[PDB]
Symmetry: C3
Amino acid sequence: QNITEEFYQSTCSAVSKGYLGALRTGWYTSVITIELSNIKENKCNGTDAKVKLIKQELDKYKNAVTDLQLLMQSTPATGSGSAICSGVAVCKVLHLEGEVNKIKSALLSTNKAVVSLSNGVSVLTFKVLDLKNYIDKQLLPILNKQSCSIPNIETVIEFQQKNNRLLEITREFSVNAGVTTPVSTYMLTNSELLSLINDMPITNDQKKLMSNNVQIVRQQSYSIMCIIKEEVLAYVVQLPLYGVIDTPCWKLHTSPLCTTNTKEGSNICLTRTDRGWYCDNAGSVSFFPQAETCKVQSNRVFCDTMNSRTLPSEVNLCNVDIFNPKYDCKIMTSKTDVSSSVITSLGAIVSCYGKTKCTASNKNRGIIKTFSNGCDYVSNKGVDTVSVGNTLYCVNKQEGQSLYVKGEPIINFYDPLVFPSDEFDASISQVNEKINQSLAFIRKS
Amino acid sequence: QNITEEFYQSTCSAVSKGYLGALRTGWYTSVITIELSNIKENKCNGTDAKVKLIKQELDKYKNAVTDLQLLMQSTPATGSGSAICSGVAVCKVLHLEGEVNKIKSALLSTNKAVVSLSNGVSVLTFKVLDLKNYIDKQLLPILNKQSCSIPNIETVIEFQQKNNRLLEITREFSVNAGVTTPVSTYMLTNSELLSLINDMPITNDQKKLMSNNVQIVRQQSYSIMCIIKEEVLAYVVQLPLYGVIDTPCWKLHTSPLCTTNTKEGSNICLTRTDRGWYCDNAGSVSFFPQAETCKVQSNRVFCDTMNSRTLPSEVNLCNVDIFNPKYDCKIMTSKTDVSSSVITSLGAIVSCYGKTKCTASNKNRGIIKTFSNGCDYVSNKGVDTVSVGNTLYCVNKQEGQSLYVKGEPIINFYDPLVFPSDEFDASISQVNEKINQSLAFIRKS
Amino acid sequence: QNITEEFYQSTCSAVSKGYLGALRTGWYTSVITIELSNIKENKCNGTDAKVKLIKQELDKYKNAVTDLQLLMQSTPATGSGSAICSGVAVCKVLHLEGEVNKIKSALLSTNKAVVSLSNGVSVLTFKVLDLKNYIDKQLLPILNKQSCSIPNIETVIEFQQKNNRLLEITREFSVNAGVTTPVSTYMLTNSELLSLINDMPITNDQKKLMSNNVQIVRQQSYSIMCIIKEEVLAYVVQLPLYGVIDTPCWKLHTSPLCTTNTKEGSNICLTRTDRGWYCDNAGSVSFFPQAETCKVQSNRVFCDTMNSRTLPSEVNLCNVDIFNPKYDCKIMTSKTDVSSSVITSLGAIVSCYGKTKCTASNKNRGIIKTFSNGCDYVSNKGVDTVSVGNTLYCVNKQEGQSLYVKGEPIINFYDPLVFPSDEFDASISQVNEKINQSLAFIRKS
Ligand SMILES: *[C@@H]1O[C@H](CO)[C@@H](O)[C@H](O)[C@H]1NC(C)=O
Ligand SMILES: *[C@@H]1O[C@H](CO)[C@@H](O)[C@H](O)[C@H]1NC(C)=O
Ligand SMILES: *[C@@H]1O[C@H](CO)[C@@H](O)[C@H](O)[C@H]1NC(C)=O
Ligand SMILES: *[C@@H]1O[C@H](CO)[C@@H](O)[C@H](O)[C@H]1NC(C)=O
Ligand SMILES: *[C@@H]1O[C@H](CO)[C@@H](O)[C@H](O)[C@H]1NC(C)=O
Ligand SMILES: *[C@@H]1O[C@H](CO)[C@@H](O)[C@H](O)[C@H]1NC(C)=O
Ligand SMILES: [Zn+2]
Ligand SMILES: [Zn+2]
Ligand SMILES: [Zn+2]
Ligand SMILES: [Zn+2]
Ligand SMILES: [Zn+2]
Ligand SMILES: [Zn+2]
């Protein structure tokens, strides 16, 4: 909806509100079949280039099938095994005797058909390529003789077009140990993907969402290779199910908050930790530390709960009351006062220290704000770039309202001498108790 | 052989035993040649589309050769230079005058031939593509006249098939600064790779291993571009030699071990460090911290010693006796009691703290175990998924025996007040001495 | 110029001097247009394979245009937005009404033309592909009838060659959300890149530099997709401008510096931090912590200031005087004495501790130096490999002069008992004051 921002001068942090989240909570698997031709090598009298070209392209069909066969005899484990158990279970059903015969019967007349497997999964099966029809009708009557018949150059070219998708799928499945991500258009065409989305047991408001963000759907999908058996090549595409739709999502941005003394070695720093995406999820907050686990389309966010952290909903109160022991508001400390900048959703946080020249300029007006020593913030309204030292950042031109929450920087509440300057993932209340215990050691003496 | 597991309740860690390791200790280089045609651009009377198509494809042959030439005038350094010295030394020999003339003579009649270079290396050379034969026989008599002769569409298509492998190799060598990894099927076909494996100075038991794991061999190989000189395109493929075969390998899994007090801010945590693959290697243990440096095929492990750490064999005794100062059993400490789970080889470790809902469910039975506060473990026998908060993990369905080693969690042996909660790569005996020194400061006062 | 090295025995660090740097400080954008044909699907009497092949390839042209259209309706945000503001601003100008009509007029007769946009940018526009000319002249008179005319197989093949570049560009723009990097030869051919370099407002000495390192230029460039409007496909290529040329650049290499006591648990370690590339830049030093932000061609370095840190020029004095509080010479401390090696530009630093077998061998001479416990260094003159434990490193064979700066290891100046063994990003003067404060706590008692 409306993207807004709030910069907290007290903690040198910003929160971008107003995002609508789509959290993946389930998987929808689908079987993709390719009708193959069970043929063995045949040698006949061949000389003219058209016979050679067909036999050359026919061998690329042969090596592609054998490459997929030795891939399933020994399949190397992948780091995606903890996320593909839903689709891997489907490949084990197809390897059972008689199960490939079922999908082979349902896809006898149409491209799409629903198939009830022997494991209780009513999966939707597609036949995206038919090589048995082309080889047995156009190639076998030409090559299964004493001397090879002469094929036309149209047949040589038409067969290279059909065989191409098989070769490209074997290429991806071989280099990725049968589990590929994202799902390419070779694994599933955009036309096939939209038709697959439409047939999903999801709401009409949810089908419009996945259809407008098909590239994000591909990046959050898996393609799993199953088995080759009885002239059938089958592989499972594992598509995301977003059980959480239109949930509030905020992104926390943090920057170092140091003191501004004039002698280096006499300054202490403080920075909020656990920056990233926070979204309401099932009575708690799902935090996403990794940056690539949430795809954004500027109004919206698409996250995967596979790489998330479950936090109490009180964690959002660290932005308004950080000194409350009721919520573990975590920080890191040091004595490294180096200047930096963070480009937020509607502006930029600037931490300027030392002799560094920090500024924000407009392309046609020039320098419109020069930052002093400390932590500050600037809106994107009228600002194009932000320069910190010899580094120039670009400000996001997204429309929205920024709110500057003025307040005393909390680093000024700390006596420098007894400060813990080597804390990593420490809570605010944790550090204060460590300071109260270290001050008693000076009180008695 | 038999994959087994041992979960240590005292240290919240699991060790997966029974893996057979294959550690790379050497390199076997091989020269791959492509016979090129030394031709310059020729212009003749051309109009019909077949002459244009040949000249268009002929220019793609020309720009591909010139692109490889300017790549060798200035070749950017790569991060693989510390691992390709064996193959880079071979390219420098070919750049010597008269050395390319030798391999050009040995490959005069056959595709494969052994060549003794001028540096003491008896390397095996392959001729995988012959473009000089096709250009000089089928194209030059057509184009080296006053007016161009009319080539058939079979020639136009047959030349695009042969020229394709050259264009794809130049594409990989250009984007990767002459050093590509893994070695694609364009650099070396599966047929050429198996034939190359067979001719290696390794045991017959070792040839069967590399032939059943060709994809892992590709991922642990390098393709290095040499020189283009005297109508010859040569590049070295650097293949792995596994001097260590069938060595015991165990994978250590660790999870946070915290106390279970009811007031947050009064709990301390502890976690074993240096998780990853450990393998016996030459009287010591080779530890692999990076996750991608060891490829697994579920019975076996394929690691590269390039990114390994050499540890004394006593490091394995940290799983049975962690408090022994004879071996530096390292841990990290904090006060961050956040729930998490780790999917092991035969089960899952669960560290549950706070209000987090941790559970393990079966697809048809439902919740079969609910974890309480602390660190626990569950077998894969009967378990399909593990849920921690809003995150659901998939359990590996590998067959094996798990062993639950009961014991008091070592975190209970620590007084919370004087605990060091900010140690990173500290030893157990190191921390205890720091606690004995900090307790004396309270003893005197 | 001349690459030299200096190893500091006192700090276990090496500095490789003599590199000439090229720091990117600006962007030069250019518009790349592809003339498309505004056609809708037409159905006529078609049977022979040539009509089917044209209509099949024509649909791949249709889906490629529609895929680029739905990509611009909703474009996912990328992590490169902070570096593509220069090029993104150009795409917004083309989306204005009447602006695409201007470039469409300038490119009416030639491939290249300068166009003054409605935002003050005098950009250079290229027309690299003309599909409207081929479709409207060779395909529309064949297909826009009652029954389809029979096209020759030369037309079917000639159209697959022209349409291929469009399909490959749509593939890259779709998987990368309209912002691709590096810029492939499909986005911009080597012939087009060199011509684009030549027309740049840079010095003749600067054009020779970019032309000899086109692959590095591609890796530091961006390709941004603009809009499809009025039979024109336009996208911006953002090329680097190196405002800093021939600047001195040094690379700092660090290795752990531990004590050599015989009882483990009684040793302390120390390591300089902030290793990487340092270059003089505008009166300060630009430090590059990330390894991939600087491309090297062995004489030269090509860095991007987008991911850099601005430090005072006094930071170089940490190599000759580390104990001076005037510059924050930062270190990290621990008690982890594990052996390791670092391959430098002209040699190798070796930190050998414990029972580890550290050595440096020559291929024909064997072991030429055996390292003892502590930190040492070896030149590349006569050395081929360096072995530490079960790990073998390769030494860079670059020509240059090494200088061994002898000195007492600074770790011996520290009393082990009161040492801070858990400091991360701490300054030398910071740690010494923490030791002076901890010794007073023992002085009074
Ligand atoms: C967003 O802001 C506009 C004002 O520009 C307001 O009219 C609208 O109601 C806001 N949307 C929501 C969901 O509050
Ligand atoms: C064609 O086949 C015959 C056998 O039917 C064989 O004798 C002859 O050599 C073949 N022609 C070739 C191989 O060119
Ligand atoms: C593996 O376990 C089986 C029991 O299922 C046993 O018969 C076999 O000997 C074991 N293998 C080894 C190498 O001990
Ligand atoms: C063909 O070649 C002749 C010279 O031999 C030249 O005069 C003529 O223009 C050419 N035809 C073209 C270029 O179409
Ligand atoms: C590099 O070293 C050579 C000596 O081998 C010397 O002649 C030359 O002047 C040096 N270059 C520079 C720029 O100092
Ligand atoms: C050819 O077109 C005619 C109409 O003009 C139509 O009746 C006929 O069925 C077509 N032939 C086909 C579709 O094979
Ligand atoms: Zn069929
Ligand atoms: Zn951020
Ligand atoms: Zn030959
Ligand atoms: Zn693990
Ligand atoms: Zn035109
Ligand atoms: Zn280095």
